[PDB]
Amino acid sequence: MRSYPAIPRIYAETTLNMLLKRAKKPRVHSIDEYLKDGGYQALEKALNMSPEEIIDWVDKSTLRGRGGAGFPTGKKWKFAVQNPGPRYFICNADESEPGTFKDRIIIERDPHLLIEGIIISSYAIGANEAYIYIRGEYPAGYYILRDAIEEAKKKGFLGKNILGSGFDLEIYVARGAGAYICGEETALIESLEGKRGHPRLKPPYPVQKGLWGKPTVVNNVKTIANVPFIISMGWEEYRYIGPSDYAGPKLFPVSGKVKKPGVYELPMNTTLREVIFKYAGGTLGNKKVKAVFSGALDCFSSEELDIPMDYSPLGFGGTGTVIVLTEEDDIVEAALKIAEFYEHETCGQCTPCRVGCYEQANLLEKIYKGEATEQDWEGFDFVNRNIQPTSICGLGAVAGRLIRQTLEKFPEEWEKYR
């Protein structure tokens, strides 16, 4: 039996039986087991279709990006193909945001779903070279993908003239080495070109100018994973899954003070309360929910649990990452941990980001330890509001966001530190 590094068995549960159909089980599903559930047949179907028709189905699916900005996938592919080739396809598997551990279970348990979607996607946009960029702290995933890619090649789904279609593809797997910024799509590309992970000024978008200056689609693991399903069922059936306006399965990583922490494949009409109480089994010790941290992006109070988990103007949004804190949990100490993350992850290109992420964390620690001066307090307020100016990526745009929200929604807890 081919042995991989030890991986914790993250709990996974689905009501939709799609992205988690196999990945609900904590083991590697290899190609024979995947082929037996009709795997790779959406590929065979896609190869009998024009690249344009595939683009068109994916568009009419209303599929939107799962890396957290929600950009329409079909529209993204259209933009790339309107520019001359050669073109490149990149699967973004960096998943390094706190509270986020969903992309990894697809990689580790159902590699072939991902690979199948990479091939269809590559063919749709005319790319003959694709890449998975997987974070370095995911060693088992790396080795699982390398082996699954070889299985796929052996059975003839990769290489030259795949299934007699005249379409060539090699998938290369790159590893990271400790940087959340390399999940930002331009920083990822820089790292693939063998450089440091410094984000580029956008526009240009990668679909115009990306890897080696050429048109490049960067899609997230889960986005790609929906592609085999769209081709398999047709775009009409995919759009019947969940709300008309938020179509498709969504994976929700629920962590913190919950009885049943793990990954939940649910439709997007699900509420935040239903995720924690109906699906994740309630709280540890039945304590009151104080806050939910949407990864390192937002902070929801216990008065905002009856919102839907969609990109709605009044929805949770983000990536549906649910870290739960209960009534006895120090919100200021939690914010510090969020401050420490951005401090370690700024690339340093933009000055307000470089200094702001540093100083936010440095000053917030002074506050937490009760060694902050009056000016340290007022400076902390100022820098938290001034990390964003001149920033070229979304890190510097958000590095003060969650913390601001704690200040505003838990003012009485902060005053205890003053």
Partner: protein
């Protein structure tokens, strides 16, 4: 001067020949070097620069940017402990205390026999199984001191 052993230079070449361009293999090459020596030996950078057809400056800048790489301390086993939000809520401090009791060291430190180094890391992407730690490529939830002790005993 510094030359890489034959069994290792082979693997670096495999990496270099794998991607369409040599320079794309820098991170895999550095993971390999660190896997072989226990750390990134400072004298390894120049020869690798030559194999990737890159300036030494370039390579050194890369080693500095990527946190997994260590140019300072050799260790047979790196114990990556998550110090981010979820593991903290669930008992990062209990794992560190248990590591202190068993191994006698704190984050940043190496055992005197050069066998274990404790490296504090950001979210390892296993937050549901917090508190999380890795021993080289192996990843685990921490439950107790006794449980920790048994796991570490497996690294000889």
């Amino acid at each position: 001067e510094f030359e890489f052993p034959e069994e290792l230079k082979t693997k670096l070449q495999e990496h270099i020949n794998y991607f369409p361009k040599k320079r794309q293999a820098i991170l895999l090459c550095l993971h390999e070097i660190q896997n072989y020596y226990g750390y990134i030996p400072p004298e390894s950078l120049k020869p690798l620069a030559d194999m990737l057809e890159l300036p030494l400056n370039h390579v050194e800048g890369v080693v500095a940017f990527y946190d997994m790489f260590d140019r300072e301390d050799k260790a047979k086993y790196r114990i990556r402990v998550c110090v981010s939000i979820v593991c903290h809520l669930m008992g990062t401090n209990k794992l560190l205390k248990a590591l202190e009791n068993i191994l006698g060291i704190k984050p940043g430190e190496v055992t005197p026999d050069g066998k274990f180094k404790i490296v504090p890391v950001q979210c390892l992407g296993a937050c549901s199984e917090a508190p999380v730690f890795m021993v080289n490529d192996d990843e685990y939830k921490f439950e107790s001191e006794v449980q920790l002790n048994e796991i570490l005993s497996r690294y000889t």
